[PDB]
Amino acid sequence: LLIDNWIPVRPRNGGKVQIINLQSLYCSRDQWRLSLPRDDMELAALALLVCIGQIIAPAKDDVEFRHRIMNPLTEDEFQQLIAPWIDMFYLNHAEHPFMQTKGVKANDVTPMEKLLAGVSGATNCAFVNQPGQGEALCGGCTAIALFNQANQAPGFGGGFKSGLRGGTPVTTFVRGIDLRSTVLLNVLTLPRLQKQFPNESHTENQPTWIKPIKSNESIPASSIGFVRGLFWQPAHIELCDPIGIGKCSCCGQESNLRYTGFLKEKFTFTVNGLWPHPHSPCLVTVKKGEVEEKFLAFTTSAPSWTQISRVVVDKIIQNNGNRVAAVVNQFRNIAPQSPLELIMGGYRNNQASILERRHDVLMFNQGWQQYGNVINEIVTVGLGYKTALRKALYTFAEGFKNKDFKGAGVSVHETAERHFYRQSELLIPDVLANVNFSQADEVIADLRDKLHQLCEMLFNQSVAPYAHHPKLISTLALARATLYKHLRELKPQ
Amino acid sequence: EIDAMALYRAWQQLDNGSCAQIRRVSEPDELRDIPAFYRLVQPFGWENPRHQQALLRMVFCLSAGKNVIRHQDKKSEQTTGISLGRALANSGRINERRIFQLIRADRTADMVQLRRLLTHAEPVLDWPLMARMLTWWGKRERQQLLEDFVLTTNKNA
Amino acid sequence: MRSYLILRLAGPMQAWGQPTFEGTRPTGRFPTRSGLLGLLGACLGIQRDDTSSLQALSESVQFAVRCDELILDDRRVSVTGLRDYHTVLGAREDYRGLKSHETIQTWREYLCDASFTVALWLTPHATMVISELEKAVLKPRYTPYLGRRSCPLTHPLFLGTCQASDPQKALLNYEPVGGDIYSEESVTGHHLKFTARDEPMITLPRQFASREWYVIKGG
Amino acid sequence: SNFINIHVLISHSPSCLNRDDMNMQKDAIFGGKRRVRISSQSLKRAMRKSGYYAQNIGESSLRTIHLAQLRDVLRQKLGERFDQKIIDKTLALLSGKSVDEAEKISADAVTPWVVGEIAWFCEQVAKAEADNLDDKKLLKVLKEDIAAIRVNLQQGVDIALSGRMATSGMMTELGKVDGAMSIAHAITTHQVDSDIDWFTAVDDLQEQGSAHLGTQEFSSGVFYRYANINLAQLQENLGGASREQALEIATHVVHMLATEVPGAKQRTYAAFNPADMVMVNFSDMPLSMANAFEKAVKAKDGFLQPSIQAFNQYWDRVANGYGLNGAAAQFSLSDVDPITAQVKQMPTLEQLKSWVRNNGE
Amino acid sequence: SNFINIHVLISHSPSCLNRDDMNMQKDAIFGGKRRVRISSQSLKRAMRKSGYYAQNIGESSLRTIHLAQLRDVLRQKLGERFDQKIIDKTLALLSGKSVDEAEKISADAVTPWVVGEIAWFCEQVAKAEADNLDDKKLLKVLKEDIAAIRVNLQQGVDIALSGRMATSGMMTELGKVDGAMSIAHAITTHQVDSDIDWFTAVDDLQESAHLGTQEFSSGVFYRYANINLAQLQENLGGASREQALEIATHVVHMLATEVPGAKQRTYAAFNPADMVMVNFSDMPLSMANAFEKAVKAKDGFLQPSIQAFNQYWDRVANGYGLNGAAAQFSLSDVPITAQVKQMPTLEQLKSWVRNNGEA
Numbered sequence A: 001l002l003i004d005n006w007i008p009v010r011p012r013n014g015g016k017v018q019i020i021n022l023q024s025l026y027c028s029r030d031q032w033r034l035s036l037p038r039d040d041m042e043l044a045a046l047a048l049l050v051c052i053g054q055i056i057a058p059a060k061d062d063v064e065f066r067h068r069i070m071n072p073l074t075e076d077e078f079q080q081l082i083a084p085w086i087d088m089f090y091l092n093h094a095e096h097p098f099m100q101t102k103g104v105k106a107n108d109v110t111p112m113e114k115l116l117a118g119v120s121g122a123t124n125c126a127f128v129n130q131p132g133q134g135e136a137l138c139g140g141c142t143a144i145a146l147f148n149q150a151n152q153a154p155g156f157g158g159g160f161k162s163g164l165r166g167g168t169p170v171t172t173f174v175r176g177i178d179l180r181s182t183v184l185l186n187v188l189t190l191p192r193l194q195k196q197f198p199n200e201s202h203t204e205n206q207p208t209w210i211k212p213i214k215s216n217e218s219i220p221a222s223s224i225g226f227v228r229g230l231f232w233q234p235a236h237i238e239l240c241d242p243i244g245i246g247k248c249s250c251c252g253q254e255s256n257l258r259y260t261g262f263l264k265e266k267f268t269f270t271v272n273g274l275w276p277h278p279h280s281p282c283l284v285t286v287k288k289g290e291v292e293e294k295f296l297a298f299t300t301s302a303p304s305w306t307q308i309s310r311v312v313v314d315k316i317i318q319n320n321g322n323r324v325a326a327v328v329n330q331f332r333n334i335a336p337q338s339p340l341e342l343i344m345g346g347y348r349n350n351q352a353s354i355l356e357r358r359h360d361v362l363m364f365n366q367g368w369q370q371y372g373n374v375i376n377e378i379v380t381v382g383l384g385y386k387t388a389l390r391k392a393l394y395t396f397a398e399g400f401k402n403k404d405f406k407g408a409g410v411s412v413h414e415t416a417e418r419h420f421y422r423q424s425e426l427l428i429p430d431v432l433a434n435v436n437f438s439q440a441d442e443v444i445a446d447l448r449d450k451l452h453q454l455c456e457m458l459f460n461q462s463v464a465p466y467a468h469h470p471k472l473i474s475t476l477a478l479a480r481a482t483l484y485k486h487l488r489e490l491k492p493q
Numbered sequence B: 001e002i003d004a005m006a007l008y009r010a011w012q013q014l015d016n017g018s019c020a021q022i023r024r025v026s027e028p029d030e031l032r033d034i035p036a037f038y039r040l041v042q043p044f045g046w047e048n049p050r051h052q053q054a055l056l057r058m059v060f061c062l063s064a065g066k067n068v069i070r071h072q073d074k075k076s077e078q079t080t081g082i083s084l085g086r087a088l089a090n091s092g093r094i095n096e097r098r099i100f101q102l103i104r105a106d107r108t109a110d111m112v113q114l115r116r117l118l119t120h121a122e123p124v125l126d127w128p129l130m131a132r133m134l135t136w137w138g139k140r141e142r143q144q145l146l147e148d149f150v151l152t153t154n155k156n157a
Numbered sequence C: 001m002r003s004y005l006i007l008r009l010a011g012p013m014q015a016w017g018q019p020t021f022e023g024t025r026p027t028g029r030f031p032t033r034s035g036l037l038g039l040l041g042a043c044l045g046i047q048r049d050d051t052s053s054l055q056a057l058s059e060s061v062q063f064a065v066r067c068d069e070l071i072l073d074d075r076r077v078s079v080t081g082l083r084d085y086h087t088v089l090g091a092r093e094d095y096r097g098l099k100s101h102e103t104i105q106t107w108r109e110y111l112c113d114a115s116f117t118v119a120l121w122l123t124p125h126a127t128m129v130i131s132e133l134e135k136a137v138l139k140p141r142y143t144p145y146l147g148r149r150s151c152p153l154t155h156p157l158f159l160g161t162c163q164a165s166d167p168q169k170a171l172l173n174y175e176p177v178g179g180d181i182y183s184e185e186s187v188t189g190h191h192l193k194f195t196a197r198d199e200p201m202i203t204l205p206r207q208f209a210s211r212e213w214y215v216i217k218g219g
Numbered sequence D: 001s002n003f004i005n006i007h008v009l010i011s012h013s014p015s016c017l018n019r020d021d022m023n024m025q026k027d028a029i030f031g032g033k034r035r036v037r038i039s040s041q042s043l044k045r046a047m048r049k050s051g052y053y054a055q056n057i058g059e060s061s062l063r064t065i066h067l068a069q070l071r072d073v074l075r076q077k078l079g080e081r082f083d084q085k086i087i088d089k090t091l092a093l094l095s096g097k098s099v100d101e102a103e104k105i106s107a108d109a110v111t112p113w114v115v116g117e118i119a120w121f122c123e124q125v126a127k128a129e130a131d132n133l134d135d136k137k138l139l140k141v142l143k144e145d146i147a148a149i150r151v152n153l154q155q156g157v158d159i160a161l162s163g164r165m166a167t168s169g170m171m172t173e174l175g176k177v178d179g180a181m182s183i184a185h186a187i188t189t190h191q192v193d194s195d196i197d198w199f200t201a202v203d204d205l206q207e208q209g210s211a212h213l214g215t216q217e218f219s220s221g222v223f224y225r226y227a228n229i230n231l232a233q234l235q236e237n238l239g240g241a242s243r244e245q246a247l248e249i250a251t252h253v254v255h256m257l258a259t260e261v262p263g264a265k266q267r268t269y270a271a272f273n274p275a276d277m278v279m280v281n282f283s284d285m286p287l288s289m290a291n292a293f294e295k296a297v298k299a300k301d302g303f304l305q306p307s308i309q310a311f312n313q314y315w316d317r318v319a320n321g322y323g324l325n326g327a328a329a330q331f332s333l334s335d336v337d338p339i340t341a342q343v344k345q346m347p348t349l350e351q352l353k354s355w356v357r358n359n360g361e
Numbered sequence E: 001s002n003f004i005n006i007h008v009l010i011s012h013s014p015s016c017l018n019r020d021d022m023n024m025q026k027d028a029i030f031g032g033k034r035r036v037r038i039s040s041q042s043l044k045r046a047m048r049k050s051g052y053y054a055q056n057i058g059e060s061s062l063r064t065i066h067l068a069q070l071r072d073v074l075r076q077k078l079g080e081r082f083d084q085k086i087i088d089k090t091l092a093l094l095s096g097k098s099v100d101e102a103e104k105i106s107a108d109a110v111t112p113w114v115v116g117e118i119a120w121f122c123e124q125v126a127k128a129e130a131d132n133l134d135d136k137k138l139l140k141v142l143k144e145d146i147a148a149i150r151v152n153l154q155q156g157v158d159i160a161l162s163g164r165m166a167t168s169g170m171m172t173e174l175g176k177v178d179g180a181m182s183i184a185h186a187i188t189t190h191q192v193d194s195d196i197d198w199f200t201a202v203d204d205l206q207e208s209a210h211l212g213t214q215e216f217s218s219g220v221f222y223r224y225a226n227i228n229l230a231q232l233q234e235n236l237g238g239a240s241r242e243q244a245l246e247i248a249t250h251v252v253h254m255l256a257t258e259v260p261g262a263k264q265r266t267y268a269a270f271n272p273a274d275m276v277m278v279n280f281s282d283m284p285l286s287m288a289n290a291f292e293k294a295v296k297a298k299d300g301f302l303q304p305s306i307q308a309f310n311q312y313w314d315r316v317a318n319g320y321g322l323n324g325a326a327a328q329f330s331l332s333d334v335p336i337t338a339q340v341k342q343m344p345t346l347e348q349l350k351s352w353v354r355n356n357g358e359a
């Protein structure tokens, strides 16, 4: 990867796409930003870049951090000293090769569609999607596919595994004006690095490809180590023989070598879960009883702002609180008094089949490091007004058993939630982008007033066609009552 | 412009002779026929005429009796007048489907259903709220009546 | 000064694409470049196969979109979304054979009730003149729809032609003013970007690449 | 003019012609008011799968495309990508019959999804000639696809008018076939009040016990249907081909929109109503008259009359101002104050169809 | 022509023929005006369980999701001809549910069981016992000839008319019946406001009781029904059309005379129909929009209703140039310009129908 010259980018202000080696990226003043046809793969790319940059160059001092950001982290020699690692080949070595296993060749052969996350996951895919994205793939367009598949996608089920954060895990990366600055901004300083995975003594710092997964039922776990975990790719697949000089099906560009398939097989193992990933937040839950640790994943069709609090607010048990991702935690310490520009993305899954994909860039102004409680507030507000509408319409539909009121009954909350969410997406992220955290709770008040009006209007709108029958005009009295019983607990301030 | 509460007072103080004439009427257009009515309403009043429907309805409702409709000022604490739905609900005499039928009623039928409800109820209410709803008497007002009734009857339980 | 062609998009429903490989097919609050390009493409008669005329059209024209909030009986009608639940009997388990599922389901987001006023001008490297587009937009040779065939027009595309320096100054000549604006130019004294993947990657079908709109607000 | 616009106002007795995943009536918000809706997809399926469609477009004279009759043009247009013998190998493969001189054209006109489709076959048999798999071996692999195109070579009008079936097994950009008729969503001209049928399922063995409770949403409406036909595209995708034939095809669509209804819940409810008004209009540009109903139509003596009136009034002021100069004709079951002398009034649907058949003359 | 259209105008004295969850009259909004309504589903049942149905069509289907009761019933009626275990296996194959005891077994949803087919299936399972072909093989064999199974459906005609649908067992593969009768909800031709009967229960021993309400209303109802003859032939096993029309006439008669029995003890709305029209056509048509403009009273609602119906029919027939076999039966002939045949009595109308639009 380092010598390889695989990275696709475009210059910030104007561009024709160019293909690059990690060297010229790390050693240049030019402002480059990533460029691909798909965003999830851009995220995968940048995650790869941050992973490797973190592995090769993680160290103090904070001054060095800032300096590396503003002034390029290498004269060619400075960087050339930095790459002892020769694990990035997929030339291929028979011994290592390629961020996946070699040997274990179990025909028949499978096309490269499966590795591109979105396509051919399901039936409607064959119906609604363009064909022939999987014909031919390249050094970059493929490596990115592989990493993305290992970490951010849940394929392919059926005795395969997804690790380590889980399936559909979400990423959180700090963004800078240029790819260079960005890749570094998410690197972990040697001590911040040391705090999380220090134990070391039971280290393995050897990738699945350098040293293999220990066959079956292991257990050991928690001794994954600094390196072997981040480049943990359990797919256990031998990438097929490269071919040709022609366009990447999706890289969009001419390439000297291309890949038109891969070979797969079933591999099973199991690990005790407490492995600390710098890239994603995780949520701590207590019942009864023993604590429950797992990583944030998109579960529903809901707007992204609903997640914000989880992404940039740390918590401690037992309130039960979440834990933010390490990279964010680092960034807040290193540069307070600087606004965040977070990028977060992930999938929604059932089995092989991808249902929704979200990739986001979220904006915060200054205070979020200090009193991100305010941030938690606006989320809980926005949700508090939602659940009011939902409960009111649920009562409108199912009805009150006592005292003997008959319910509608049609499912109106379901379709109103979408309207609410749609019109909310306009107002909540937008404020949260521009609030003077220091003295800004009047802003929240105007927000509550607008959400209040929205809930009133949507409630009245959703019920309007059915309220011509005294049968139901009676139920909406009580339903409207519950609506305002819910709305009153929120607003006054 | 708009119609005062002075109409209510005027109704209260007018002699029994005239009031017996007005009280003796099945439907509002029949109220239009008799003279004491024109004499009552001339001030407020005929012939704007945008007001006339409202005045027919109002007087027709008032016609129920001398003290069928009792006027109670909004309390300082509540800051909202007790309204017709709440009143009919409060009286306890009224059965809800007779109000459902009120919602279902059309033109002359609606007032007649209503006049019948008050006499049996002997309600207390803020007169201009009744005036306001009677002035328009749109579907919204009809619906609000029932909502008010059901809600207060449920609260009172 | 600058020559403009001014168009209007006026369906009871509209759909303008956003990134998807799944069955759920979203929309945004305003048209997309790929959409508008496809729209003139249709009006001009450009078939899907010939990259030449597509590429020509894409290089040739640039757009500016003004959002027209609706007023009737002097009450504002804000825009709104739909989610159409959309099934298919059949079809197409594979791209190749005659084999099908009984039922595939898809969800499709639509836009109500939205009107847009849109200005387009010639790039320097233009391969055509504004008058061809005029002629093509007044008499299309393929059916113009926005942006699914489900959704027709209620006002003709052609609204008018103008001379002006800035697209703003050009849009102001046409009636519903005060709408938010999204342009590729420029504009002085206005800062904010808005990011979208609506730039049709014409060389490679059927995928798109990132672009940014300059955002303007009248008040 | 290239475009034919069909506007239908149809009223329906209580029913539930189209449903969402949660068994609720499909709706749309127009003019700021909820409208009950019937999706284009449902209308089009109702049309496409109708008997009348099968009779008049399934059994159309232009349904069969003969490949032997297109040797000259196919060689001409594909001479640049392939060599003639490869082309011949493909056509000989598809038709299974070689090279007999056919006195007919040679139309000098070829629908683009056919040249598009056969080109792909030329690409396959070419490199198959390269490999080289001898014809018997490769025939085994392309066995599905040949059948797939052969069935498509018999549905010209159907594919041309309504677009590919898919699954049609077509594999190229040119083989994405659209049009020629565009069908709009049908929305009510008025805001609707929805009636919930609160039904039950009685057990004969447990007849005197509490029952099985169910809810179904229905509503009656006056729906505005809009449809559009691009004649040039129809000829292009179909022929050939003469306008008169295209118009003959258009009349069928006109009939179907006036008479055809989606079959959803037509057993249990029975909204088998015929269209109360139909207008056909020729134009350079397609236009829908939905904004006639942007202001929701309020009942005076039902929704139908004021809907017709609203439509008529809108057409009068708006139509000239827009691109709709000529030529349009209307079929009504009745109203006074017809819209204007400008449009010809037609007593029957058949006369309207005839009017369309003769290019609105 | 394939489609037979049945139009009925029937007037009713104050009644409550069909009820809401709140014991309120079923209604529908048409032309922006409220109408009293009678569900199709209720009419169909009133037909199935009618005396006339038993007299002229036979055995009404047995709809229940109680399989345990059906075990016993089927054993009682088919015990003499079969073995209980075979019956059991047959039911288990048909419902997908296992049949043993298991005091309560139950089905996914209420399904129309005719006993004849179950007997037939038991015979098939006896022939299955010989081989014995594994149940799937037997199913593969029985999927080939559906019509044979449908011939058995001449008992249980109601299913042939209104259709059944299976999710579970082998009834999903063999039991799917569609068509053949389409029936509308019956709606008033005019706007209704519903009368509230305020009743009391008198305590003899201490005769001040209190108040219960029943909502009633009298209306003129328009009933529409439709039969797809071809589909009925298919559903009955290929039966002759000549046979199908007889069933159709029975449906016409029932549609003209039968009334739901809900609250008929206390409100006796046993009225026949003042008009019945039948017409043959290529495509189904309903005359409901004749009444979209709610009919205003001149001398009752019935008279203007008949008039409205006829005028709308003229407009549609001329506009759509429907050349069709059509015949009308009225009690009050009082008159259509239309070239539709007038029948003095119902029996003549029925005969007209039996003889395929006879003239």
Ligand SMILES: [Zn+2]
Binding pocket: A137, A138, A140, A141, A142, A248, A249, A250, A251, A252, A253
């Ligand atoms: Zn690539």
